Amino acid sequence: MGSITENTSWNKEFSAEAVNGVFVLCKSSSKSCATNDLARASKEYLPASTFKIPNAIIGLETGVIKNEHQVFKWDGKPRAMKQWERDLTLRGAIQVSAVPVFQQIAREVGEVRMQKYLKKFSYGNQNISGGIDKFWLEGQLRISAVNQVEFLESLYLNKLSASKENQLIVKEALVTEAAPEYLVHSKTGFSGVGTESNPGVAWWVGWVEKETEVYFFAFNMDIDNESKLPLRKSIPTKIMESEGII
Ligand SMILES: *C(=O)N1C[C@H](NOS(=O)(=O)O)CC[C@H]1C(N)=O
Ligand SMILES: [Br-]
Ligand SMILES: [Br-]
Ligand SMILES: [Br-]
Ligand code: NA
DSSP states (O other): OOEEEEOGGGHHHHHTTTOOEEEEEEEGGGTEEEESOHHHHTOEEOOGGGGHHHHHHHHHHHTSSOSTTOEEOOOSSOOSSGGGSSOEEHHHHHHTTOHHHHHHHHHHHOHHHHHHHHHHTTOTTOOOOSOTTTTTTTSSOOEEHHHHHHHHHHHHTTOSSSOHHHHHHHHHHTEEEEETTEEEEEEEEEOOOOBTTBOEEEEEEEEEEETTEEEEEEEEEEESSGGGTTHHHHHHHHHHHHTTOO
């Protein structure tokens, strides 16, 4: 990251909802970032579902995901969310956020190759301990909002240590809004409601391409009640609207 500046006026959107969280927003052409909370911007949290971004790239890189047209077939046995109980494309599995699909990808990648690529990607604390199929869900892997926007900028620029084609495949799978001169790539996450005195984390990360500008963003918040989950999009959306992005 280049320069980061704390803008405490963004806290207004947080205190209104009694949310403890951070937003990091970087405008590409100026190589500068802003945040409501410098300290929390660098604090590391479980990636949860945002890990589908590196996991998908690594699956393609290692050949575990054969190509972008691979279909992940449902074996017909119960899955934890009904929206996952179906065959899914790579983009579908990311968009509906089908954990079991990505757990099996991780198992087939294996510990050695997973470690190799998180080191290549400078992904968080790069600690994969806790089980190959769950280190990013309940294990020891942690990543900060600053690190997310660094990783996403590299993906946007096709500068990750992976093939350009594999980065491009995952990028189209991350498109969540498309208009003639407005394009959003993003991914949500939710680690859970945590435990007593130890809240879970909710994420929204991505980037916005508007005209010839691009804005990288990462949001996280403490969460111990699922009813608060939509704030992971509404707080950053209000901030980006106040900046004229949205
Ligand atoms: C990812 O964080 N998980 C899978 C799924 N993601 O949906 S979300 O991105 O809208 O948060 C549900 C939550 C979470 C999980 N239970 O693992
Ligand atoms: Br499941
Ligand atoms: Br996942
Ligand atoms: Br949401
Ligand atoms: Na955490």
